[PDB]
């Protein structure tokens, strides 16, 4: 920068640490579930990866964005708060 | 001659404020009734 303190040196470092032990979930929404399984039925992680809604070999978490109307039987990890309510209102079940 | 002093809540001992005073004009520790965010009310404070 010509000799003045550069932008990458006169600014403070971003605060905090990064968790070495953090677990990451691949997410899918009930709107996507409703779009992909109009007939309802069982909805497993293998079904999700086959339909391409989620990456393979990863932990799956279900979130609650969208409208769900089909009666489905979703098995996953770590359901959301809204996802459980929407699934049970639709009439299915959410096992872990 | 005018050092920086810090005031701690009497009850919870939290170091809440830092300020200045003249050590000669005020050779003794200050008492002020400041607001304590921990206790949530106004409490007495004193130097450390």
């Amino acid at each position: 920068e010509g000799g003045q303190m550069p932008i990458h040196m006169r600014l403070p470092k971003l605060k905090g640490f990064r968790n070495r032990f953090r677990t990451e979930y691949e997410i899918v929404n009930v709107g996507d579930i409703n779009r992909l399984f109009p007939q309802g039925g069982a909805v497993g992680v293998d079904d999700l990866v086959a339909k391409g809604a989620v990456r393979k070999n990863a932990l799956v978490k279900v979130l609650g964005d969208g409208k769900l109307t089909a009666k489905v039987d979703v098995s996953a990890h770590k359901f959301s708060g809204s996802a459980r309510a929407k699934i049970t209102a639709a009439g299915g079940s959410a096992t872990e | 001659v005018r050092p920086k002093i810090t005031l701690a809540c009497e009850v919870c001992k939290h170091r809440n404020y830092i300020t200045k005073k003249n050590r000669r004009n005020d050779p003794d520790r200050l008492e002020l009734k400041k607001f304590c965010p921990n206790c949530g009310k106004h409490q007495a404070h004193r130097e450390t």
């Binding site: 932008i7 990458h8 040196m9 600014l11 403070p12 470092k13 | 920086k4 200045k20």
Partner: protein, 62 residues
Amino acid sequence: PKAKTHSGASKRFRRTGTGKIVRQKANRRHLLEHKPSTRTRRLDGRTVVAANDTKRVTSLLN
């Protein structure tokens, strides 16, 4: 040869969910007795990098 990113730049900048680059603000590490709460609150938080610096910080990050 694989391109290397800048260590200090990657420690001082980061991107958001739409690609904005954000930073913290200076003057907030010490000598805080004479700084009023208005000034300290102004210096608190994160801000988007200025439009006249975005090109160079992007080049540093990539």
